[PDB]
Amino acid sequence: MEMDKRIYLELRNRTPSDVKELVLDNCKSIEGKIEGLTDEFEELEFLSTINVGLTSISNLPKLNKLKKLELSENRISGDLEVLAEKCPNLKHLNLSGNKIKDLSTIEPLKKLENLKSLDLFNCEVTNLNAYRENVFKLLPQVMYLDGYDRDNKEAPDSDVEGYV
């Protein structure tokens, strides 16, 4: 079952509008098209595409209820400017192992004022000095980067009740 059929299999259990989370994990794509991810996904919040061979994300539908997009382990070397349209509500984006090597590539992300957390694990920006500090210079929305916030604290899951 290819990328589209992986999606199709789940869409059989529930229609795109009812799919809150659907992951394409290590699934061979059609070619360079997702196909299955249409803007029929009303309440699609969590989605991952771990190692599916996506070089460009110019196949994204306008998911206005999105929350988490894992694009980790893909040949993403740009084409992020499409996110301003398809993801004007996304706060969580994983670029783990993606070919985002320069701060110029993350500039389109400043258009997404909802972004709160970025994952740069094994991302190409690791070859940059003070990569976190430089990201906060451009992207002023994200509060968390690689698990640590602006205070250099690991994102508290319980002990964040206005105290430290």
Curated annotation (Swiss-Prot):
Predominantly expressed in the cerebellum. Expressed also in cortex, lung, skeletal muscle, gastrointestinal tract, spleen, liver and heart. Residues 123-161 form the LRRCT domain. It comes from Mus musculus. Component of the SET complex, composed of at least ANP32A, APEX1, HMGB2, NME1, SET and TREX1. Directly interacts with SET. Interacts with ATXN1/SCA1. Interacts with MAP1B. Interacts with ELAVL1. Part of the INHAT (inhibitor of histone acetyltransferases) complex. Interacts with E4F1. Keywords: Cytoplasm, Endoplasmic reticulum, Leucine-rich repeat, Nucleus, Phosphoprotein, Repeat, Repressor, Transcription, Transcription regulation. The modification Phosphoserine is found at residues 17, 158. Disruption phenotype: Mice are viable and fertile. They have no derangements in any of the major organ systems, including the nervous systems. Moreover, bone marrow cells from mutant mice only show mild decrease of colony-forming unit(CFU)-myeloid. The keyword Transferase does not apply. GO terms for cellular component: cytoplasm; endoplasmic reticulum; nuclear matrix; nucleus; perinuclear region of cytoplasm. Belongs to the ANP32 family. Multifunctional protein that is involved in the regulation of many processes including tumor suppression, apoptosis, cell cycle progression or transcription. Promotes apoptosis by favouring the activation of caspase-9/CASP9 and allowing apoptosome formation. In addition, plays a role in the modulation of histone acetylation and transcription as part of the INHAT (inhibitor of histone acetyltransferases) complex. Inhibits the histone-acetyltranferase activity of EP300/CREBBP (CREB-binding protein) and EP300/CREBBP-associated factor by histone masking. This is Acidic leucine-rich nuclear phosphoprotein 32 family member A. Phosphorylated on serine residues, at least in part by casein kinase 2/CK2. Residues 150-164 are annotated as: Necessary for tumor-suppressive function. It is found in: Nucleus; Cytoplasm; Endoplasmic reticulum. The modification Phosphothreonine is found at residue 15. The keyword Nuclease does not apply. The chain holds residues 1 to 164 of 247 of the full protein. LRR repeats lie at residues 18-38, 43-64, 65-87, 89-110.
